[PDB]
Design a protein around this ligand. Structure first.
Ligand SMILES: CCOC(=O)[C@@H]1CN(C(C)=O)[C@H]2c3cccc(C)c3O[C@@H]12
Length: 284
């Protein structure tokens, strides 16, 4: 069923809450035993948001390999994403260790450091060229190379150095700065312009490791970004773009991380983004 007609049918019937609860009921439940070990309590931002054991990213260290991060591997679309929480004061070194070890080119940030008057994630990148950051626990150095501030997003060029080998890599930081403190954007225009700036950079392409995507918990805004990207890629690949079922794609993604799309309004926004986005994939 053409999703644009499914959309109008749910809107006219006002059934978004019902559709969303059906997804919650059918979603996968896999063990997260490593996330719940006592040694890992200060590595989790939220007690109710944990990576599954089967899909969690492992740090390359014998001490403690745990980070709150999941590999979302989309087999038909040929895309992979790492979805993670906003870094905590004691996990900023782990965060950059993961980017290094997984060979990521891009980090996608969908929150502000402060929202609703509370801290939603650590200040984990440098704000001035001449004030670099050193992560002594993981032996990494991080330098701000350039910053491009736009109305709806900021792009930063960062240099990450493995101090153990003196290898360096260029990381791109894509920071969506205008998601509202409450609810979802009235239009999906800026978020879609943003997704396509990430695509144009190479950060989502198979010559690199998976993109790292986060918000505060790494499930709500983060889930909207990967869901919209994968649905648009499937529409460009299939003979019948109308066969793409956003609810079925979301349930596939929920096999790899719990809770993706946190509200009925985020579900409606994801439909709007794919619909309004589709009016280009198809040749405009
Ligand atoms: C309400 C939605 O309309 C939009 O804002 C555009 C829709 N779209 C796609 C991929 O469908 C994005 C896009 C593609 C190329 C260039 C731009 C500046 C751009 O912005 C988004």
């Amino acid at each position: 069923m053409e999703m644009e007609k499914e959309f109008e049918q749910i809107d006219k019937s006002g059934s978004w809450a019902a559709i969303y609860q059906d997804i919650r009921h059918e979603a996968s439940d896999f063990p997260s035993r490593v996330a719940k070990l006592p040694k890992n309590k200060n590595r989790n931002r939220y007690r109710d948001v944990s990576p599954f054991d089967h899909s969690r990213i492992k740090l390359h260290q014998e001490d403690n390999d745990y980070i709150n991060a999941s590999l979302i591997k989309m087999e038909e679309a040929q895309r992979s994403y790492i979805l993670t929480q906003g870094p905590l004061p004691n996990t900023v070194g782990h965060f950059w260790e993961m980017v290094w070890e997984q060979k990521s080119r891009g980090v996608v940030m969908l929150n502000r450091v402060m929202e609703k008057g509370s801290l939603k994630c650590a200040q984990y990148w440098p704000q001035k060229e001449e004030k670099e950051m050193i992560f002594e626990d993981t032996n990494l150095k991080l330098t701000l190379i350039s910053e491009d501030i736009k109305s709806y997003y900021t792009v930063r060029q960062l240099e990450l150095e493995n101090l153990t080998t003196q290898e360096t890599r260029e990381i791109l930081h894509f920071h969506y700065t205008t998601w509202p403190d409450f609810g979802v954007p009235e239009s999906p225009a800026s978020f879609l312009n943003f997704l396509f700036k990430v695509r144009e950079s190479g950060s989502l392409s198979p010559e690199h490791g998976p993109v790292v995507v986060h918000c505060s918990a790494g499930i709500g805004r983060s889930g909207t970004f990967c869901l919209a990207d994968t649905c648009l890629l499937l529409m460009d690949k299939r003979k019948d773009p109308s066969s793409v079922d956003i609810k079925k794609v979301l349930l596939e993604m929920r096999k790899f991380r719990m809770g993706l799309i946190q509200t009925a309004d985020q579900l409606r926004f994801s439909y709007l983004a794919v619909i309004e986005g589709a009016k280009f994939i198809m040749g405009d």
